[PDB]
Write a protein that binds this DNA or RNA. Structure first.
Ligand code: K
Ligand code: K
Ligand code: K
Length: 49
RNA sequence: GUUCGCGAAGUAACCCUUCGUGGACAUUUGGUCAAUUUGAAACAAUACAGAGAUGAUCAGCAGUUCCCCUGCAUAAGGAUGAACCGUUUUACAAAGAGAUUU
């Protein structure tokens, strides 16, 4: 989490990294965290289908 | 305490003196805070190592950041102040062929 948050802090526009971080939380079975990551990504770019 | 008024005692009687009594004057400070270990300062010390773009030695200026420090500062300086360097899979479809199955 520290790694992913560091990268997203330095470059919030990396939508691929946002998705990979959300998937990492999915693999931890922590859907609340995954949902939060997806929501934050939608806050950055809601147009990315 | 003072002062205005009244009772009284002392004095021959006033002034004056004392005991009693009513009124007037003056009227609510300070704390976000307790005095060493357990509600938060840091440097330093010991060790190792010895600065980005390079084959080598270096000037830099920036940008991004939920890192700031020094400075009066919107100046300048702090290794180009530092961190930056990793990890990376699906709007996934169309046409066709040869093998698999009833
Ligand atoms: K050196
Ligand atoms: K330099
Ligand atoms: K500089």
């Amino acid at each position: 989490r520290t790694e992913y948050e560091g990268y997203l802090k330095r470059n919030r526009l990396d939508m691929g990294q946002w998705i990979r971080y959300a998937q990492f939380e999915i693999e931890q079975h922590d859907m609340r965290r995954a949902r939060s990551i997806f929501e934050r990504a939608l806050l950055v770019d809601s147009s990315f289908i």
